[PDB]
Amino acid sequence: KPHRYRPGTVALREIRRYQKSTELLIRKLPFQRLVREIAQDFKTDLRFQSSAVMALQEASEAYLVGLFEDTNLCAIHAKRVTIMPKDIQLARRIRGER
Amino acid sequence: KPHRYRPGTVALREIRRYQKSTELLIRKLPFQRLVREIAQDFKTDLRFQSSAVMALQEASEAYLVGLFEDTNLCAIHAKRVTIMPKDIQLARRIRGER
Amino acid sequence: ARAKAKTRSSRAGLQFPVGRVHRLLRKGNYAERVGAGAPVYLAAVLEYLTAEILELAGNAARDNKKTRIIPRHLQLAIRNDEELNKLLGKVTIAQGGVLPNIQAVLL
Amino acid sequence: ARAKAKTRSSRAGLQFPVGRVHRLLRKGNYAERVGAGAPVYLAAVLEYLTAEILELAGNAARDNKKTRIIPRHLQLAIRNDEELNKLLGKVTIAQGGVLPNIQAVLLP
Amino acid sequence: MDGEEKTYGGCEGPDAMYVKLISSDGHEFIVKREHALTSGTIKAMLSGPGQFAENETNEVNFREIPSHVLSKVCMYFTYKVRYTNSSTEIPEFPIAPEIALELLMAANFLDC
Amino acid sequence: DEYFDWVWDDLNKSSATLLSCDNRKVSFHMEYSCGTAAIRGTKELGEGQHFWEIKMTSPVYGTDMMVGIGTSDVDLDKYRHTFCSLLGRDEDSWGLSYTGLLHHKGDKTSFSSRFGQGSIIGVHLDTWHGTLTFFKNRKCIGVAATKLQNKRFYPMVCSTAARSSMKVTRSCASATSLQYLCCHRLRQLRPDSGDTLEGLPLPPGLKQVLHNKLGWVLSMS
Amino acid sequence: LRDNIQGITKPAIRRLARRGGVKRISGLIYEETRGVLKVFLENVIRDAVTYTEHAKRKTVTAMDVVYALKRQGRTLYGFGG
Amino acid sequence: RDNIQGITKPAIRRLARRGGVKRISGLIYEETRGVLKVFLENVIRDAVTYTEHAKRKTVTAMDVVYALKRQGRTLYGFGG
Amino acid sequence: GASKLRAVLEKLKLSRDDISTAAGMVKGVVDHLLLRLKCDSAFRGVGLLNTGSYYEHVKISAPNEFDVMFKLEVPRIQLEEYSNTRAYYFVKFKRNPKENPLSQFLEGEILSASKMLSKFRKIIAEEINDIKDTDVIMKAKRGGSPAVTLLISEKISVDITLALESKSSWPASTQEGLRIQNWLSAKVRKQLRLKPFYLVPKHAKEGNGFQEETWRLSFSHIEKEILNNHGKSKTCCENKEEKCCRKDCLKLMKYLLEQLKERFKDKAHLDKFSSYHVKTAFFHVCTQNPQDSQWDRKDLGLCFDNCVTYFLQCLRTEKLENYFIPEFNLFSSNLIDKRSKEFLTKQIEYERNNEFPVFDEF
Amino acid sequence: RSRKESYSVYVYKVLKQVHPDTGISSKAMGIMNSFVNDIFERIAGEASRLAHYNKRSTITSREIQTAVRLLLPGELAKHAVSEGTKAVTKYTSS
Amino acid sequence: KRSRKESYSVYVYKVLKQVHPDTGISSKAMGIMNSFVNDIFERIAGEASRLAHYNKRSTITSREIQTAVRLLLPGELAKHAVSEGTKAVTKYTSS
Amino acid sequence: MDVFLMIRRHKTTIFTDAKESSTVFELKRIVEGILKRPPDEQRLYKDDQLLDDGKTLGECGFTSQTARPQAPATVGLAFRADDTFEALCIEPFSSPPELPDVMK
DNA sequence: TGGAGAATCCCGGTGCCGAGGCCGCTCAATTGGTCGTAGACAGCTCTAGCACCGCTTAAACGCACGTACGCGCTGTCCCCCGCGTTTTAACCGCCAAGGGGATTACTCCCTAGTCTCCAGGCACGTGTCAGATATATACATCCTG
DNA sequence: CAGGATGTATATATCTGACACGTGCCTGGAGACTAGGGAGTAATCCCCTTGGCGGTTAAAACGCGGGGGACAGCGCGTACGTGCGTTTAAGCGGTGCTAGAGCTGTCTACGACCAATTGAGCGGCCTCGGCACCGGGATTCTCCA
Ligand SMILES: [Zn+2]
């Protein structure tokens, strides 16, 4: 009962651990299924290879982790701390990619 | 008394003409002096072709007029309508070229 | 022996010069040999893309009711189409200007 | 007849293979009469530039008490430094991770 | 027409085949009898008695007519007695305006 | 005025026309205009010289109304049931329409200005020189035709408008004579004047008999 | 195989936001993140296949993937050269 | 010598109006003067570095577009 | 003479205000029908073509018989000739980002007009019953383009038409047409060519029946602008003195071609001849005699006589070519029987020789 | 004397075959000329890279067909490959 | 049959092993420098094809490439990269 | 075919129309038939040059071309001075007036 | 000002697998020679960068003053965050099948290189008509009452 | 709500210089031919994608209590927008001028090509030591009184 920390402390203690860490965070096989599923609308009967799927997570999660990091810079400018979908739609427009 | 337009109704008549015209907004001679004076400490006694000057001006107008547009979207997201130096410093690091 | 010179453009039916594109593709240092079909295929895709642009610009120019196309009408045609605008996304057309919009909360 | 050979990298003073590069370049369509200034420039320049990316690992490995240099340390030894991170920031270094950073308004 | 003996050289009394026509200024214009009879004055005059004898001098002097005028009268007679009843195109009869101004008097003077 | 030299022909008028005013006047298509109608004048022209003129009265309209000359080989009732140009159709026959255009030999030439309601037209013929001349409003338009020698003709006029009429105002004949030929040549040499009697001691009785014989020549060009 | 996009879970999208340094989160964003990843993937996989077709192969291999990222300016060092 | 104060208050205003902004702070002017000078400092350094291979004493239009094209700023109208 | 024509012109003219009183009834119907149609995905942009006067009044003696035309604006399209007929086309879409108009009317690749009209018929037919303040009824089909026709009570009546609008350059098949240059100067020719153009649905027809799925060009908006602004001087008829008989000469000519059909409708041989042909012949004529000096009110006679002269000449020779598509022969043996043509020359030339008897019936 | 060469006539000929009635100012021709130069060089750059990737010594229809459906977005790629294939069969069949 | 394949390893190693004597390196720490050096190759060889047609120079030679490497390395590192390719233009010229 | 001509001497100014093939001697037979002086007692001169009776007027250049209907060409008759040609006995016509300016 | 979980900073011993070293050999880099045209130069010429001089009126500077925006504070009630429970689906280690990516032999038809000929682009230079300009009038909108 | 004052739209009429043409001619695009070697094919083989199995326990889905963040509404006085009068520096038309980039004849120094030799670096087998990993004792910092 008594130890329960004040809200928003555990949300700072856990960013430190993931910024020291270096491994990859999307669960592996659930992404491997999606890349064969999404490919089928361009061509058919098509084989992959281990290093062709492994290199493709490294491409994906490295752009998601670089996106959130300046949505977080947009919410603070609006005098907030909670991230919400109106913010990411600003970030991926100042980033030119529309 | 005589005919005063209310604050804001002449500012909208303004953006609604600069968004439907083509030409340069900075004066010629004052931009030429700055270009020669910046240059004279990479090497001495350069000469310039006239169209090398016009190619620098056009590349700078389109850097500034496109940076103010991202500055506007930043200031509006924060519920203001007035631009401030804290919005310039947001745009230049989400744009990310630093 | 030297018979009459029939130019290749008329055979494949283009307006683009099937001869000059062959010489440029030879001289430009791209590869060791230039195949026979490359100058025909390439002139046909550059025909398609230029023809697609020119009539959208013409439609803007003609509703603005002028005899000639000018850089403002190119801008208003390309910068206003979902897949021409994607194809040339990072190029500043000299003396084109910007297309008008006001952010809705300023009104 | 047939005197002892001297390697043409040593004849230019380089460490980089002025031999191997001249094959790549002259068969590579990029220029036609490959005057020795060209196999030598494309070889020469990159000497320091190929070491900087592990030289600057002294900022990482010995400092962190490790004696085998590793991809994470190679990542930090590029993505750490002032101009290094503009000089080559437009590229992702695989298995790197990210630098420690928190914004000042969010903490107690 | 050759060897024109005509039994007597002509018919020069009752049917006198030529008649002798002097102008006031003395030019003599012989005319063949149908050309003579073309003038109403001359056919009336040749119808006169005594002139039908072979002993007649078939002569006139036109005191009222000068020689240049009388030539055009003869030209007109020779023209019309030729071209009358022509089924082919009859040629024009142009006469010089610079001398012709008077010639209408011949119509009333000679009945022509 | 002096009495004209031929009437319209009672025996040679089409099956749809009434001759009138002592056959000086004539009328056509008094109801239906269900075809073309025509007449000749009573006199065959083929000897000597002729001159005549016609006054219009009903307003011009319809396919063609025209004036001219032709052989006896024409048929006044071929087009009894049909609109056609009867004059000008053949080597036999010529005519001028109110639109200012001639026909001959089954072909056309533009020749003059137009003419309409109340107009007056006059025509000269010389059979000796085988030639024909046209006048409007006491002024000359030109020589129409030549090479016409020894062919025999009647004068013909044709109609197609309903309720339409015309009248010959004068018609005349002459021989060739000095008072014809010399007077013609004289008028070719002074056509610029409105008159020809000017400057002449020539008797007023002779001036009047050439007012009779060649009334046009002395006073038109 | 179908509908593996729902295999991008809430807590995976939370792990990726910890490395971005973000503190509180709106419950609407998990449906927005899975909307931007969908079109990241498409423009990469739709070029690795076009290289493979030009090769006339049936298999797809790491070099085709790095040629794809490289083409669109996301270039990566560590799987080839 | 200065010359950076040659970009006046009303010039910096017209750039913001074409960019679509309605109302302006007063400290903006000495902020933009520090941003423009650091842009020109980098493109002029590359264009003069091309001009030495090209042997000339004159900087050409094509030296400056090689430097823009190298920075990431392609530009239709001046040829090339 | 000219007094008969001046009189019949008044007797035509003074009927006009009855049309103006009737025009209120159709207005409410067309307004409801637009507000019906704008709800449907297939028609969201549809609109009245003749803005500011919501009808065309196509028969001058029929003051209850309106015509209405709806423009349906279409993005950008490609066209090709049916069977080298020059005036008739198949149409197909091209390069367009994802904003489908109604591709559901596509069949293989052609946009099906027959599918379009099938929906258009149905949606009007199910709507029009809900007009409750007025008796209104749909009248059965006659032909390709007016396939919806409508009656209010037992008088006020409408044919409804729809057309595609396009903004693009006009086809190469018209390049030599519109010979306005000497009449109205090249500066107006170019600025008139600077307008949109229209396609109307029309089957080809054959001994085998018909190529049902085809379109034909249309230029009626331009045709109105010429006639409205008909002077070599801009101010022609814009003041009382600068008046000219051009307009009068045309409307007199339209009226005649109905009167002759009234007297021979039982023979059926004249039924193929329309006020469309009458306009077309008039444009060649005013092109031929283009100075405003020829069109004094003190004429009227010769200009009207020139129309019948020209029309007879065309009709004898089986030749009348479209004024915009300068080689498409409307009088051709393919489209009209020789017998009807020669028969009509016999009628018209009889009327001319009889001094226009049929206008005495008024 | 020294001599210069351009795409000017051919783009003018294409214009005069879709708006066969409309002109272009000298400044507006300059942009169209730099546009076709850019697109040629993008396509040729992936063609030369494809030939290197796949170890070959020539550029042919098979190379340019992949570069077009690689550098052109969405339905422009779908249309451009038909304008390509239909123009070469007209040539090999002549 | 065996199909032999090369890398830059030994040439970078001789510029590095001057500074840190007391270290070794894992396999996945080699590919980053291979792909860096190989990236610059075809990018500068493309610049070399351009340089050739820029100043009409079919004999490419050192001084034409030169500009690209005072350009591509920002800061005083412009001098580092160009110094390596300029210390080359001496001895080979004299056999 | 007969050619319109005019024969001139002293008073005489005589129109005639002889076959073009006629000898110059046949002109003398015609002249005797009109003027009774026999064919040899007569002589002929053209302009003011002697002409032989043994010729034909066609070979003497007197022809259908010289025989215009209103200008049948002139020929010089002679009646012998017992031994020779006499004078070219021609005498002038009455001089015609000017056409006055009122007619111009 | 005292508590107590989470590490975490640092340590012990253990373990294994991968990186650092050695050998065989073959194939690609070099020596020595021959050869042909690129480009390094000395002159010429003529055009484009730099510099100067008045004039005009356009717009940058300086000021007063009113008002509506930016800035602070308070209350409250939604909407996450921190914890325990039940479970379901990764990662895992191992395995049997067979598909096509990678390698060779050999044949030939496609291309580059050559010589000749000649017609389609290029540089030049006159004309005229498409748009910029001025002035007058029609119209649509904002503001105070 | 009506009525005034102001700024924008438009439609002739004027004038001049930018675009579309005609042509002299020359140099680069078609015609013919042939001598090699790049690419096409048929046959081969073996390693590496593929699909399957039970399994351990790490990780995800669910729920539930309530604290403080998101946000509405209220007060407010300072900073900026509108506009009038003065005055100063950009832009214009015309002159000069010579510094420099472009063209070219010519000749000699450099890089492509070749055959024969042998040194540099690549592929395969080996083994101990660098840095992980399992228990673990010590040492901080937040949250309540
Ligand atoms: Zn009028």
Author numbering:
A (entry chain E), B (entry chain A): 37 to 134
C (entry chain G): 10 to 116
D (entry chain C): 10 to 117
E (entry chain M): 1 to 112
F (entry chain L): 100 to 320
G (entry chain F): 22 to 102
H (entry chain B): 23 to 102
I (entry chain K): 161 to 522
The authors write:
Inside the nucleus, cGAS is attached to chromatin by strong interactions with the histone H2A–H2B-formed ‘acidic patch’ on the surface of the nucleosome. Considering a role in nuclear cGAS regulation, we therefore hypothesized that SPSB3 might recognize nucleosome-bound cGAS. Consistent with this idea, immunoprecipitation assays and size-exclusion chromatography (SEC) indicated that SPSB3–ELOBC forms a complex with nucleosome-bound cGAS. To define the molecular basis of cGAS recognition by SPSB3, we determined cryo-electron microscopy (cryo-EM) structures of wild-type (WT) and C site-mutated cGAS (cGAS(K285A/R300A/K427A), hereafter cGAS(site C)) catalytic core domains in a complex with a nucleosome core particle and the SPSB3–ELOBC heterotrimer. The overall topology of the cGAS–SPSB3 subcomplex within the two distinct maps is identical, but the complex incorporating WT cGAS is not as well resolved, probably owing to the heterogeneity of the sample with formation of varying higher-order cGAS-bridged nucleosome fibres. Human cGAS, but not mouse cGAS, can bridge individual nucleosomes through C-site contacts that engage a second nucleosome in vitro. Modelling the 2:2 cGAS–nucleosome complex onto the cGAS–SPSB3–ELOBC–CLR5 complex results in steric clashes between the second nucleosome and catalytic subunits of CRL5. Thus, the mononucleosome–cGAS complex is the substrate for CRL5–SPSB3 ubiquitylation.
Cyclic GMP-AMP synthase (cGAS) senses aberrant DNA during infection, cancer and inflammatory disease, and initiates potent innate immune responses through the synthesis of 2′3′-cyclic GMP-AMP (cGAMP). We identify SPSB3 as the cGAS-targeting substrate receptor that associates with the cullin–RING ubiquitin ligase 5 (CRL5) complex to ligate ubiquitin onto nuclear cGAS. A cryo-electron microscopy structure of nucleosome-bound cGAS in a complex with SPSB3 reveals a highly conserved Asn-Asn (NN) minimal degron motif at the C terminus of cGAS that directs SPSB3 recruitment, ubiquitylation and cGAS protein stability. SPRY-domain- and SOCS-box-containing (SPSB) proteins bind—through their SOCS box—to the elongin B–elongin C (ELOBC) heterodimeric adaptor connecting to the CUL5–RBX2 complex and recruit substrates through the SPRY domain specifying protein ubiquitylation.
